[PDB]
Amino acid sequence: SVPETQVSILDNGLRVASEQSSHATCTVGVWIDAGSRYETEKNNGAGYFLEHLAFKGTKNRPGNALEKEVESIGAHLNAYSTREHTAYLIKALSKDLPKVVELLADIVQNSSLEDSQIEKERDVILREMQENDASMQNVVFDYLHATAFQGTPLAQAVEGPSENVRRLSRTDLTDYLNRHYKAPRMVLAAAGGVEHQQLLDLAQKHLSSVSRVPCRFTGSEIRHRDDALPLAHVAIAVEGPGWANPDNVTLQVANAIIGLCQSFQTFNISYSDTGLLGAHFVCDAMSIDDMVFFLQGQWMRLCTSATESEVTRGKNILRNALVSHLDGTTPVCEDIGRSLLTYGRRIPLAEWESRIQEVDAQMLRDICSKYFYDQCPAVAGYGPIEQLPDYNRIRSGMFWL
Amino acid sequence: EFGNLARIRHVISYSLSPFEQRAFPSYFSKGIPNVLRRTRERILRVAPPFVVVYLIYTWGNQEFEQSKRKNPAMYE
């Protein structure tokens, strides 16, 4: 009974997708298939710095008058960038649907990058990075990406190295903007109280101008020993299958089974036919090795012996979590934008439920043995990590005798 | 034990998986140069004592023989 996500396509290739619902406020966003994976180490912070510059004024709406408009209807304006996708989204009321779309049009095209602003946003970005190091789990996941995807564009961070940040100019940005903002790589996603025909007419009216035009898992480890920190963060991952491979669903159930360290989180990060599947835990130094041992046993267990009931637990757990319908509009659309960018279609919740209920214990331990057993992991540690075991002990813990 | 051995800071340490690296990379490529590099730095400290051991050993042997040699003037 969940309403279907209807997708149309303009000549530009900008797929305009929408999923109407009763809620009177909507989350209209633009997703773009452009991240740090498409950068070539000479423009490693171009997407991040453009994400900073995108709300500082356009040609038609110069400066803060633009954001005055998004204050005037009381709407909320957000943007984010990952290694593969960039999103500019607005939460607003339903009746303010046209102007919001027009605002989004300016943000993707006709944007203006002021040289004055460029220096101010450089100091913002530089400073944030200079303090970003504070967030350990971000440092550990960046280290894990770097040591797992050495020599590839997937190792480099979204923010880029301070070097590039300082060394960036309007023209470079202009390039990234004019290169990675093509209309066939763009989805206009709407969730909530929107009509699809009105949204399609608004996309035809504005946004109809947008121009129309592998990775290797290096199993290895990076350890940043700094003994003055109170807690240690350790992430261990193996290679993931990718977006389009259905056993992801089964792997998600495996994560739902795992769900000794103060904090233990499992992740299945997916990129275009690659990814990182693993666990991140933050612990006191004198516990670290025991955690690792614990964690490896669980994984090995699933690969070795997994019952029927726990599987059911994961199935159900995932089900409720996977549930996103009417979770929130922002989430809803976020899902429409990512589904049109990655799968090329919006997978409905009934298909997700079918793929969940076809998962049993035998295929779960088969897929877990395919992806976890006797695999070389990527290890990233930060903090008092002397008792964190080196690569032979972790690699030997990746199988059982 | 591990964890309480020492205090270091800001020393990042990268590494690779064994199966992801060749077994004897550039083994004889640089091994020979290095072994030779090594031998140079230690040969002058090591070798001349054993050289003079060889000279003393030979000397002793020959001297001993001569010692055993019969005096021409002996019993004549």
Curated annotation (Swiss-Prot), chain A:
GO molecular function, one term: protein-containing complex binding
PTM annotation (Phosphoserine): residues: 169
Top-rank taxon: Eukaryota
Tissues of expression: Expressed in neurons and astrocytes of the cerebral cortex and hippocampus (at protein level).
Membrane topology: Peripheral membrane protein
Gene3D superfamilies: Metalloenzyme, LuxS/M16 peptidase-like (3.30.830.10)
Consequence of gene loss (knockout): Results in early embryonic lethality.
GO biological process entries: cellular respiration; mitochondrial electron transport, ubiquinol to cytochrome c; mitochondrial respiratory chain complex III assembly; response to activity; response to alkaloid
Residues the record lists as Phosphothreonine modifications: 171
One Pfam assignment: Peptidase_M16
Modified residues (N6-acetyllysine): 68, 95, 120, 205
Transcription regulation among keywords: no
Localisation per UniProt entry: Mitochondrion inner membrane
SUPFAM superfamilies associated with the record: LuxS/MPP-like metallohydrolase (SSF63411)
Keywords: Acetylation, Electron transport, Membrane, Mitochondrion, Mitochondrion inner membrane, Phosphoprotein, Respiratory chain, Transit peptide, Transport
GO cellular component terms, semicolon-separated: mitochondrial inner membrane; mitochondrion; myelin sheath; respiratory chain complex III
Known partners and oligomeric status: Component of the ubiquinol-cytochrome c oxidoreductase (cytochrome b-c1 complex, complex III, CIII), a multisubunit enzyme composed of 11 subunits. The complex is composed of 3 respiratory subunits cytochrome b, cytochrome c1 and Rieske protein UQCRFS1, 2 core protein subunits UQCRC1/QCR1 and UQCRC2/QCR2, and 6 low-molecular weight protein subunits UQCRH/QCR6, UQCRB/QCR7, UQCRQ/QCR8, UQCR10/QCR9, UQCR11/QCR10 and subunit 9, the cleavage product of Rieske protein UQCRFS1.
Its job: Component of the ubiquinol-cytochrome c oxidoreductase, a multisubunit transmembrane complex that is part of the mitochondrial electron transport chain which drives oxidative phosphorylation.
Family as reported in the entry's similarity comment: Belongs to the peptidase M16 family. UQCRC1/QCR1 subfamily.
The protein, known as: Cytochrome b-c1 complex subunit 1, mitochondrial
Gene of this entry: Uqcrc1
Curated annotation (Swiss-Prot), chain B:
Side Mitochondrial matrix, residues: 1-40
Residues annotated with Phosphoserine modification: 13
GO biological process: cellular respiration; cerebellar Purkinje cell layer development; hippocampus development; hypothalamus development; midbrain development; mitochondrial electron transport, ubiquinol to cytochrome c; pons development; pyramidal neuron development
Similarity section: Belongs to the UQCRQ/QCR8 family.
Modified residues (N6-succinyllysine): 30
Superkingdom, taxonomy of origin: Eukaryota
Keywords: Acetylation, Electron transport, Membrane, Mitochondrion, Mitochondrion inner membrane, Phosphoprotein, Respiratory chain, Transmembrane, Transmembrane helix, Transport
Compartment annotation: Mitochondrion inner membrane
Bilayer topology: Single-pass membrane protein
Record-listed N6-acetyllysine modification sites: 30
Subunit structure: Component of the ubiquinol-cytochrome c oxidoreductase (cytochrome b-c1 complex, complex III, CIII), a multisubunit enzyme composed of 11 subunits. The complex is composed of 3 respiratory subunits cytochrome b, cytochrome c1 and Rieske protein UQCRFS1, 2 core protein subunits UQCRC1/QCR1 and UQCRC2/QCR2, and 6 low-molecular weight protein subunits UQCRH/QCR6, UQCRB/QCR7, UQCRQ/QCR8, UQCR10/QCR9, UQCR11/QCR10 and subunit 9, the cleavage product of Rieske protein UQCRFS1.
Protein name: Cytochrome b-c1 complex subunit 8
Gene Ontology CC terms: mitochondrial inner membrane; mitochondrion; respiratory chain complex III
A Pfam short name: UcrQ
Topology Mitochondrial intermembrane: residue spans: 60-76
Originating species: Mus musculus (Mouse)
Function: Component of the ubiquinol-cytochrome c oxidoreductase, a multisubunit transmembrane complex that is part of the mitochondrial electron transport chain which drives oxidative phosphorylation.
Transmembrane segments: 41-59
